[PDB]
Amino acid sequence: PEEAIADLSVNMYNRLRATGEDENILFSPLSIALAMGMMELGAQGSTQKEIRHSMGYDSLKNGEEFSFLKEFSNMVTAKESQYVMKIANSLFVQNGFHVNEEFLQMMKKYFNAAVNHVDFSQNVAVANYINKWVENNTNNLVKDLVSPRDFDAATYLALINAVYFKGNWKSQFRPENTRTFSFTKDDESEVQIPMMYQQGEFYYGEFSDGSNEAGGIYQVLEIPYEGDEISMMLVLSRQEVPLATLEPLVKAQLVEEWANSVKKQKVEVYLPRFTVEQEIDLKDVLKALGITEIFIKDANLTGLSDNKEIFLSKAIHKSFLEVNEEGSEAAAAISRMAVLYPQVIVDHPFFFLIRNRRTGTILFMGRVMHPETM
Template sequence: MKPSTPHPRSIWILTACWLLPLLFLALSLCPLVSSSDVTMADAANQEFARRLALFSINVYGKLSEQKPGENIVFSPFSIQTCAAMARLGAEGETATQLDHGLGLASNDAGQIAQSFHQVLATYQDSQILRIANKIFVMEGYALRQEFDELLTKQFLSAAQAVDFAKNVQAAATINGWVEQRTNNLIKDLVPSSVLNADSRLVLVNAIHFKGTWLHQFPKHATRPDTFHLDDKRSVQVPMMGLKERFRYADLPALDATALELPYKDSDLSMLIVLPNSKTGLSALEEKLRLTTLSQITQALHKTQVVVKLPKFKAEFQVELTDVFRKLGMSRMFSDQAEFGKMLQSSEPLKVSAIIHKAFIDVNEEGTEAAAATGVVVRLKRSVISLDEPIEFLADRPFTYALLHQEDLPLFWGSVVQLEENDIPSSEHDEL
């Protein structure tokens, strides 16, 4: 770079998601769109969900490559929301790359903002799923009016001035806001060391889910059982058990089965896609790249299922610069980045990093989860006897998703390893 060229100042994009079971209480979600808008809204929502699912599997694939052997959990909606807020301030090639890489349905800033507003507004007053956006701006710098209005009205994001030069205080302010929005589950999202006098903007999205299963797993049915890490290694883990009518699908094209576990008093559910073999997750993930979530959810049908699912917790943190670069969004991190629509001043800006952190806890009462999508040309429904219950035994690595209205993935994840965790044996009722 020539010495005379102004040095681009930094933008930080921070996303975090927290999922915590709601142990003794189920809270209702607010109503969705009015009946007069149903057709148009449904079409827009379906397209938004389809594109988010594609973005989800793309990110999931890169994270699996980047962190092999780790349990992954992330919120594709959280990541996409934060990056979309940055997109509203972008122009030129930077904007084009973000449109393509994020899978946005439009290149118009107003329409982009409106598509996210549909989901954000749905859960604005929800006690089960909380989504919050925030933009922190360097003191002495003003946002451009159009950018500020889109963030405030459509992303429900208020701007707050901070002095990034006082990096410890600035980090404490940001992290305090995140902790407050996530019931203190996500702490220290942004380290003070990444903030300095050159920082100009920090965009943050926090998403927190807590819900109870519609059909809870009885605690007396949880017992030690084997979880196969691969075809040679296994561990003993607490395995939950339940027999109930669930939506289930046999997916021969994926060499897998799928199960939907709904949450009480909401339109949210967990979708689990289980490979048929102990070492089949990698092959399943490859096939999922060519499928839509709707192909899986449309194959689901209600039947009696004996479910065995391990209790598990996972915490996951990742810096997403490399993932975004591999998805074709590299210019935003370079000195050629074009974010001229953010600030009133003409100071050059670039993204310094995208930090994402997630936590999940799945137990007998409830959960929070992440989603998967897949590659299937056609899904055939198996003929299932009504007399004989299907067994869905999640005793091997699997992938899962927390879905809004079946096809919009709010969280996405995989379970590939569990630690040895013996629990006392006791008398249990047979399922």
């Protein structure tokens, strides 16, 4: 299923949007699919069926849904001069519970995932340990994933999934051109943020918001990262229009269209320097999507443990994305065309995705409603 990746994130994004009112959104589809594969492989029977069924993998009989792991591994090993994607995937299991060795081996060899026995009854120690394991696997960029309170309830199994991404732009912004601009939130409040600026080669298109009214268009800007494979695609409504008017249009087919219609050209770009993050309770999100048996004592998890008491107490996902000026030098009568360069000023909320241009796969999807620090 090539397109299943796109639908996952698009579906997830609408869920998150549903329950997320007004907050930044950020998640990685690959990371989440990795986590769901771990659950799928751990589960058997009806438990496994809800997961495959909810994922739309009913008709996949030979493990076809695990093929995305290959590309995913490629990213974890990419050159740092292009980007860094740190991932922390782990199952934490109560000390003394047996884990099937075959499951353990698969996790290690194909999922870039560890299985860690811990004592969940020591709330502070276990939260501390989990946080340090996560920091250690993310260059200390993903912090405070869990809290002692997360283990107040009896827990025997927890799935932890985290990801940090930062890329080097193919065309750097120069820090001396970054200046304070005001950013207008969709509730009409304003905050001052560092607005990066450059004139450079991007992918740009204009698209109908569908109302066919005069002017009614939004902009799509794709900014390539060094190495030419990965890019950030920003979707920006006209200034007097809310992001929420564009969001319902978000679908795998539209993304395809953007990807194909945008054209490489000189664009003037004003982009905030910002970071965005989101921690999501995957248990919450998946329960709404049918997956519930894995989270109760009826769980059939014999794929991962012959222990009959065991179920998934906790499933956490956290993404952290950082955007700044950093990237490569730009390559040096087209100046006569300057009046025709499009202008994209990202000074209000925007939807974004990070994608591999060659494979089309979505590394991240989200939105920025608040670009401001803390």
